[PDB]
Design a binder for this molecule. Sequence first.
Ligand SMILES: [Mg+2]
Length: 889
Amino acid sequence: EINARLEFAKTSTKEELFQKFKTSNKGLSEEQVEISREQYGDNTITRGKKSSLIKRLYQAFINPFTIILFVLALVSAFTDIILAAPGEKNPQGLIIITTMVLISGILRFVQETRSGNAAENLLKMITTTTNVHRLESGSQEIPIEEVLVGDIIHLSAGDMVPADLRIIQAKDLFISQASLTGESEPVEKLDLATAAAAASITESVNLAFMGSNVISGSAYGVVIATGDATIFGEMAKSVTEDSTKTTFEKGVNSVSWVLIRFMLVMVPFVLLINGFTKGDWMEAALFALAVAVGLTPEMLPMIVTTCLAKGAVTMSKEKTIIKNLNSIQNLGSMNILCTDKTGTLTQDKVVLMRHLDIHGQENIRVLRHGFLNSYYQTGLKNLMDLAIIEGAEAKQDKNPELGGLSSKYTKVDEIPFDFERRRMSVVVKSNTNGATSKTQMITKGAAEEMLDICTLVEDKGNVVHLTPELRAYILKKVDELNEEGMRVILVAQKTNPSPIDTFSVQDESEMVLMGYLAFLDPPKESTAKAIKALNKYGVSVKILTGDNDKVTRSVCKQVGLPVDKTILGSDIDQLDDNELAAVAAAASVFAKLSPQQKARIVTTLRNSGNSVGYMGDGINDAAAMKSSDVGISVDSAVDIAKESADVILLEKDLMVLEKGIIEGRKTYANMIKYIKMTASSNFGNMFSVLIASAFLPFIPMLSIHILLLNLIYDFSCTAIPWDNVDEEYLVVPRKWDASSVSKFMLWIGPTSSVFDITTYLLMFFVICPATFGPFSSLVPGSVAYIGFIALFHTGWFVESMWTQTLVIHMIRTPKIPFLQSRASAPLTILTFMGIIGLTIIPFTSFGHSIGLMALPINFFPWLILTVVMYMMLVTIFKKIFVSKYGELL
Ligand SMILES: [Mg+2]
C-alpha cells in the first residue's frame, strides 16, 4: 500500500513536493528531520524480525551455560541458605554465582547483538557514505543508515542509491538496477514529470530505487521512501540467509553439553557414595555442589568475548577492517580464494603505454581520441583511462596536436560501458565551434566487439574498407600484443550526428577504426610469496577474470601461478554442473568470463564441498561476492561491494588478507586451547574429589575455595588471546569442535588426579598432623580440628593452582616446551602474578574469612617437586595423545 507515495512522486513534478523540494540552503531542514524520521520512517535494515530486548534477553538468558550457572545458584540456595541447619545461613555463594550469571548473560547479549549472518555492519567499524546536503553546512558524507525522507543525495560514478529516491537533476544518469530487477544492461534515468502509472515499477524512468548502483552520471534527487518500505526491504523480508556453518555459539553450547554430561554422570555418583557410606546427606549435597562448581568453568564467556574482541581489533590493525563478528569464522575456513587479476596480482599503475596504428606504428591521433574519450567520461575511470590522460598531458607540451583538449572541446552525450558490448562512447564537440559541423563520436573498447561494430579502417593514408583480411590481420596483431603481456583497447570514431541525440547502440555502429592502445599492468612485487603463503595456510588461489587469456596467462606465469588448461567462459557454458565442478576443482585460471559466469563458478565450487572467498572492487563482481561464502573487498571500491562484503581491506594486497586469515585462525586456536585446558583440569580435580570421597572425612576444598580458584584461573587466562600459536596449527582451515575437547578431558585429566591424591595424602599425614598432631586424636569442634581441615583445604588450593596454571606452558604445544615452542610473555606474566596472588591470599584477612590459613614453609618444596613431576607426566601423556588421536588440540 506504500505505492501511493511512490506514484505521487513519479507523477506531478518538483513543483508539488509538500515535503519540501528546494533544499541544501533553503528547505527548512534542521528540525523537520525528526518529523520525517518518525512520521515517514528511517533507513533501517530489518530483515525478517526485530524482536525487542524483552524477547532478546529472554532468549539470551536461556543459554545452556547460563542454565548451568543458574542451577548452581539454585542448589547453593537450596542447600546453603534454606535447607541448612539453623544458624548455618550464609549466602555468599548465592550472590557470587548470581553475579556470574549476570556477567555471562550481559556479555552473551552483547555478542549476539554484534553477531549476525554474513554481510552485516553490526560493528559499524567501516561503513558506506552518501553525499548529502543538509541545511547547516551541506556536502557532508554521512552513513547510508542516516537517511530520512526529504533529503537530497548527489549520485555519481559507483555511488549506491541510499534509499528510494526521486530524481531532481539528471546529467547522463545510468544506474544498474540488476541487483533487484535483473537486466544487467544499465538503465537510463531522467528528471521529468511523466506519470505513466502502467509500469512494472522496474523501469520508472523518473524514480531511482534502493540498490540501483549508479553506473555513470551525475544526478541529484530527493528521498521519497526509506527503510523496509523500499523494495530492498521487501526483498530482505525473504531472508533465506540461514546457513549450517558451525559457529562460536554451537561450539560453546556443545562444550556446555559435554560439561552437563560429565556433571550428570559424576555428581549423582558422589551423592550416592557419600549418602550411603558417610550417612551425611547434607555433606553429600555439599560434595555434589563442589563438584558441579569445579567442573563448570565459570567466567568462560568473558574469555570468549576477550578472544573475539582481540581478534577483531588485531585484524583491523592488520589493514583488515572486519564486519559482523562471524566474519572471523567464515574467513578462517576459506579453502578457495577466487579473485581477479586487476590490482590483486598487478600493480595497476601502467608504466608501459603505447598508441599504435593498425599496422603497429605510433600515431598520436589515436591518443588524441583516447584522451577525448577519457577526460569527458562520467563513468568509473579505470587504469587505462588514467594512463591515457597522464600520458597525453605529459606529451602535450611536445606535440601540440594534443594541445589542451580539456577546454577546446565540450561533452554533449555519452554511452556507458556494458559487459555485453565492451565499448564505451562519448559524443564530444568544440564549444567555440569554428566549423559549424563537429560532433565526433569517439568509442573505445575491446577487440572483437569493436571490430564487429566498425565498417572501415584508418591509418595508412586512407579510410580503407573493412576487408576480412584486414579484420584477421588486426585480430592477429592484437593477439600478439596481448601475448606480449600488454592489454590492448581499440578506438573508433564517427562524425556528424547533427541532432545531438538518438545515441543508442544502433548509433554505436558503422565507425572508423583509428587504432589500438596497448597498456601493461606489471605484476606486483609480491612474487608468489603471498600465493605460496596462502597455499601453505590452506587457501587455493584461483583467478576469475573476464579479460583476454594471453595477458592473464602471462601475468599468472610471472607470479608463479599455474599456467595450464585455462577454462574459458565459452567452455563453461557447455560444461554442465558436474564437469564444471571437476574443471574448477582442477583448473586455477579462468579467463574471459561473464559477471554471471563467475557467480556460477563460485556457486559450483562452494557446493563441491568447499568455501569460496571473492575479492572484488567493481560494480559487477558483487554478483559473485554475494554468491561467495566470505566477501572481501578494498576500501577504495564501489558501495555494492562493501555492503555485500565482510572483510573490507584498507589496502589491496594478498599479504594483508593472509595476515587477517592467520589472526582469525589464532582467535579460535586460543579459544579452543583455553576451553580444553580448563575443562581437562576441572575434570581431573573433581575426579580426584570423586575418587577420594570414600576416604577423606571432610570435603577436600570448600565450594567458595574452588570457586575462587576457578575465578583467579580464568581472570589470569585473559592473556590466552595474546598467546603465540604454533604454525602447525595455523596452516589448516579449522572449525569448532567439542569431541576433541572431551577426549582431552578424559585423557589428560586423570594424570592430575593421581598427584591430587598424592597431595591429599601428603596433607593428611605429613603437614597438617605436623602442625596439629594426628587427626584421629583431634576432637570435633576444637581449634586443632578446624585448623587441620583449613590447612588441608589451603594446601590443595595452592597445589591445584600451581599445577593448573603452570601446566599451560606444557599442554599449549604438542612439542617440547621452551625448546621449540615458547609461550607468550603476557601469558607467562599473568600466570606468575595470579599464582603469587593466590599464594598470598591465605596469609591475609581473606584467609580465615573464607577458611584458609598460612601454610608451613616445608609445604613449598613438596609443591616444587610435585609441579615438575606433573609436568613430566603431562608431557608423556601429551606425546601419547598426539601420536594416538592425531593432534593434541
Ligand atoms: Mg588441578
